[PDB]
Design an enzyme around this catalytic site. Structure first.
Site, PDB file in Angstrom:
ATOM      1  N   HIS A 159       0.671  -1.145  -0.115  1.00 55.00           N
ATOM      2  CA  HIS A 159       0.106   0.037   0.094  1.00 55.00           C
ATOM      3  C   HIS A 159       0.879   1.171  -0.024  1.00 55.00           C
ATOM      4  CE1 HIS A 159      -3.368  -2.827   1.093  1.00 55.00           C
ATOM      5  NE2 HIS A 159      -4.084  -1.903   0.255  1.00 55.00           N
ATOM      6  N   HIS A 196       1.342   1.225  -5.750  1.00 57.10           N
ATOM      7  CA  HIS A 196       0.170   0.625  -6.036  1.00 57.10           C
ATOM      8  C   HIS A 196      -0.926   1.845  -6.606  1.00 57.10           C
ATOM      9  CE1 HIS A 196      -3.762  -0.927  -5.045  1.00 57.10           C
ATOM     10  NE2 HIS A 196      -4.016  -0.312  -3.986  1.00 57.10           N
ATOM     11  N   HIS A 224      -6.672   7.045  -3.694  1.00 56.41           N
ATOM     12  CA  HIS A 224      -7.540   5.992  -2.906  1.00 56.41           C
ATOM     13  C   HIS A 224      -7.057   5.431  -1.730  1.00 56.41           C
ATOM     14  CE1 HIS A 224      -5.727   2.613  -4.881  1.00 56.41           C
ATOM     15  NE2 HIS A 224      -6.408   1.953  -4.024  1.00 56.41           N
ATOM     16  N   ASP A 225      -5.784   5.191  -1.787  1.00 56.96           N
ATOM     17  CA  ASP A 225      -4.927   4.864  -0.389  1.00 56.96           C
ATOM     18  C   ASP A 225      -4.091   5.770   0.305  1.00 56.96           C
ATOM     19  OD1 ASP A 225      -4.682   1.190  -1.614  1.00 56.96           O
ATOM     20  OD2 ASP A 225      -6.016   2.355   0.046  1.00 56.96           O
ATOM     21  N   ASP A 267      -8.283  -1.327  -8.478  1.00 56.38           N
ATOM     22  CA  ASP A 267      -7.541  -1.380  -7.245  1.00 56.38           C
ATOM     23  C   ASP A 267      -7.060  -2.923  -7.160  1.00 56.38           C
ATOM     24  OD1 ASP A 267      -8.761  -0.641  -3.770  1.00 56.38           O
ATOM     25  OD2 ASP A 267      -6.740  -0.979  -4.561  1.00 56.38           O
ATOM     26  N   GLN A 280      -4.439 -17.417  -3.142  1.00 57.41           N
ATOM     27  CA  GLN A 280      -4.528 -16.646  -4.105  1.00 57.41           C
ATOM     28  C   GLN A 280      -5.683 -17.246  -5.084  1.00 57.41           C
ATOM     29  OE1 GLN A 280      -3.218 -13.802  -3.025  1.00 57.41           O
ATOM     30  NE2 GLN A 280      -2.046 -13.562  -5.124  1.00 57.41           N
TER      31      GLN A 280
HETATM   32  C1  LIG Z   1     -10.724  -2.711  -2.994  1.00 52.40           C
HETATM   33  C2  LIG Z   1      -9.668  -4.281  -2.293  1.00 52.40           C
HETATM   34  C3  LIG Z   1      -9.823  -4.016  -0.872  1.00 52.40           C
HETATM   35  C4  LIG Z   1      -8.379  -4.160  -0.233  1.00 52.40           C
HETATM   36  C5  LIG Z   1      -7.646  -5.511  -0.298  1.00 52.40           C
HETATM   37  C6  LIG Z   1      -6.165  -5.681   0.086  1.00 52.40           C
HETATM   38  C7  LIG Z   1      -5.097  -6.593  -0.616  1.00 52.40           C
HETATM   39  C8  LIG Z   1      -5.535  -7.577  -1.890  1.00 52.40           C
HETATM   40  C9  LIG Z   1      -5.358  -8.859  -2.015  1.00 52.40           C
HETATM   41  N1  LIG Z   1      -5.130  -9.684  -1.286  1.00 52.40           N
HETATM   42  C10 LIG Z   1      -4.647 -11.061  -1.397  1.00 52.40           C
HETATM   43  C11 LIG Z   1      -4.695 -12.128  -0.408  1.00 52.40           C
HETATM   44  C12 LIG Z   1      -6.164 -12.125   0.288  1.00 52.40           C
HETATM   45  C13 LIG Z   1      -6.120 -13.120   1.178  1.00 52.40           C
HETATM   46  S1  LIG Z   1      -7.629 -13.457   2.009  1.00 52.40           S
HETATM   47  O1  LIG Z   1      -8.201 -14.772   1.808  1.00 52.40           O
HETATM   48  O2  LIG Z   1      -8.662 -12.472   1.440  1.00 52.40           O
HETATM   49  N2  LIG Z   1      -7.470 -12.952   3.580  1.00 52.40           N
HETATM   50  C14 LIG Z   1      -7.663 -11.556   3.410  1.00 52.40           C
HETATM   51  C15 LIG Z   1      -7.848 -10.865   5.051  1.00 52.40           C
HETATM   52  N3  LIG Z   1      -6.830 -11.474   5.963  1.00 52.40           N
HETATM   53  C16 LIG Z   1      -6.188 -10.876   7.209  1.00 52.40           C
HETATM   54  C17 LIG Z   1      -6.882 -13.060   5.977  1.00 52.40           C
HETATM   55  C18 LIG Z   1      -6.742 -13.834   4.642  1.00 52.40           C
HETATM   56  C19 LIG Z   1      -5.244 -14.153   1.435  1.00 52.40           C
HETATM   57  C20 LIG Z   1      -3.779 -14.135   0.828  1.00 52.40           C
HETATM   58  C21 LIG Z   1      -3.758 -13.091  -0.050  1.00 52.40           C
HETATM   59  O3  LIG Z   1      -2.519 -12.749  -0.815  1.00 52.40           O
HETATM   60  C22 LIG Z   1      -1.178 -13.485  -0.631  1.00 52.40           C
HETATM   61  C23 LIG Z   1      -0.166 -13.499  -1.472  1.00 52.40           C
HETATM   62  N4  LIG Z   1      -3.976 -11.213  -2.516  1.00 52.40           N
HETATM   63  C24 LIG Z   1      -3.894 -10.271  -3.710  1.00 52.40           C
HETATM   64  O4  LIG Z   1      -3.121 -10.537  -4.829  1.00 52.40           O
HETATM   65  C25 LIG Z   1      -4.460  -9.084  -3.416  1.00 52.40           C
HETATM   66 BR1  LIG Z   1      -4.241  -7.855  -4.706  1.00 52.40          BR
HETATM   67 MG   LIG Z   2      -7.662   0.991   0.052  1.00 53.95          MG
HETATM   68 ZN   LIG Z   3      -5.857   0.338  -2.818  1.00 53.41          ZN
END
Ligand SMILES: CCCCCCCCc1nc(-c2cc(S(=O)(=O)N3CCN(C)CC3)ccc2OCC)[nH]c(=O)c1Br
Ligand SMILES: [Mg+2]
Ligand SMILES: [Zn+2]
Length: 292
Positions: free
Chosen positions: A79, A83, A119-120, A220, A251
């Site tokens: 973040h 990004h 936005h962030d 995003d 993922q």
């Molecule tokens: C509008 C979007 C809101 C903010 C989202 C923040 C980051 C998003 C993201 N989140 C993940 C992710 C998401 C998850 S999860 O299943 O949704 N989970 C998310 C919440 N957390 C504390 C526990 C795990 C687990 C692993 C992840 O990535 C590890 C490499 N993967 C991504 O590629 C991305 Br991009």
């Molecule tokens: Mg955000």
């Molecule tokens: Zn963002």
């Protein structure tokens, strides 16, 4: 070293959108310096005709871009400025290559670009941070955005009329608020349901607003759509922020629960946004293969 940065930015030549490859959904920023991202950001404003239509002075836009960049935290792995910059680049590509531009007013386009970049703002990391669930973080990002927009020398919206300014502020705020995952998940069903029944209509103010919200989220999350070598790298950043071998299945779950349906919906609205959907699919295949 700060007017120095502004000096260099303002004096610099701004290469074309084609040259900079910001028109490509597969764009990546790993090889670019901060100055170069600033230059790409100028090009996004000018090629969406925003510099022209709203009379922005060059030095103000430059100062504003540098203020925005400065108010992200470099020590936060995912973040951060890059990004926000990538989110904006995707907005640009969806507007241009994805042909969303013709479906929106100039004020809407202006607001989305600013919102995508902003936005962030001032994010400190998902962990380094509410029981109310009222989008506290997104309110803070908008507040930061507003502050920069009102700072001396940074007022890129000074050229708008008072009525112009109020409507764009409203759109900017809705757009930033939309980037709250909780809000996206709440409002999703309506968007999907409408497209499902072929009842989706941009002429309705309410559905227009719903679409802008969905578009924000699509941009995003756009890292999930990138070429495999790029997505692996960004997933690496997300991982270090989150936990500052279970990653592949995570993922895949993320792509299924949150991403695939959105990019499918987007491509229904505009065929030319297909590369985002396609890129997301190819990434699902790659992560799933690794999951064994
Ligand atoms: C509008 C979007 C809101 C903010 C989202 C923040 C980051 C998003 C993201 N989140 C993940 C992710 C998401 C998850 S999860 O299943 O949704 N989970 C998310 C919440 N957390 C504390 C526990 C795990 C687990 C692993 C992840 O990535 C590890 C490499 N993967 C991504 O590629 C991305 Br991009
Ligand atoms: Mg955000
Ligand atoms: Zn963002």
């Amino acid at each position: 070293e700060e007017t120095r940065e502004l000096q260099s930015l303002a004096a610099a030549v701004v290469p074309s959108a084609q040259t900079l490859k910001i028109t490509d959904f597969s764009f990546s920023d790993f090889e670019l310096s901060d100055l170069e991202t600033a230059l790409c950001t100028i090009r996004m404003f000018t090629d969406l005709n925003l510099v022209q239509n709203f009379q922005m002075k060059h030095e103000v836009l430059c100062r504003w871009i540098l203020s925005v960049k400065k108010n992200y935290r470099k020590n936060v792995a995912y973040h951060n400025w890059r990004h926000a910059f990538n989110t904006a680049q995707c907005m640009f590509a969806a507007l241009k290559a994805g042909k969303i531009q013709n479906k929106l007013t100039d004020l809407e386009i202006l607001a989305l670009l600013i919102a995508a970049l902003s936005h962030d703002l001032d994010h400190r990391g998902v962990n380094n941070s509410q029981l109310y669930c009222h989008s506290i973080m997104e309110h803070h990002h908008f507040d930061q955005c507003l502050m920069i927009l009102n700072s001396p020398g940074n007022q890129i919206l000074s050229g708008l009329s008072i009525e112009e300014y109020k409507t764009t502020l409203k759109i900017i705020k809705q757009a930033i608020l939309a980037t709250d995952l909780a809000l996206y998940i709440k409002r999703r069903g309506e968007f999907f349901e409408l497209i499902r029944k072929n009842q989706f209509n941009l002429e309705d103010p309410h559905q227009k607003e719903l679409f802008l919200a969905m578009l924000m989220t699509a941009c995003d999350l756009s890292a999930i759509t990138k070429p495999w070598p790029i997505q692996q790298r960004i997933a690496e950043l997300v991982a270090t922020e989150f936990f500052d071998n279970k990653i592949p299945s995570m993922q895949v779950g993320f792509i299924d629960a949150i991403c695939l349906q959105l990019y499918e919906a987007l491509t229904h609205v505009s065929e030319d946004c297909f590369p985002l959907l396609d890129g997301c699919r190819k990434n699902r295949q790659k992560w799933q293969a690794l999951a064994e």
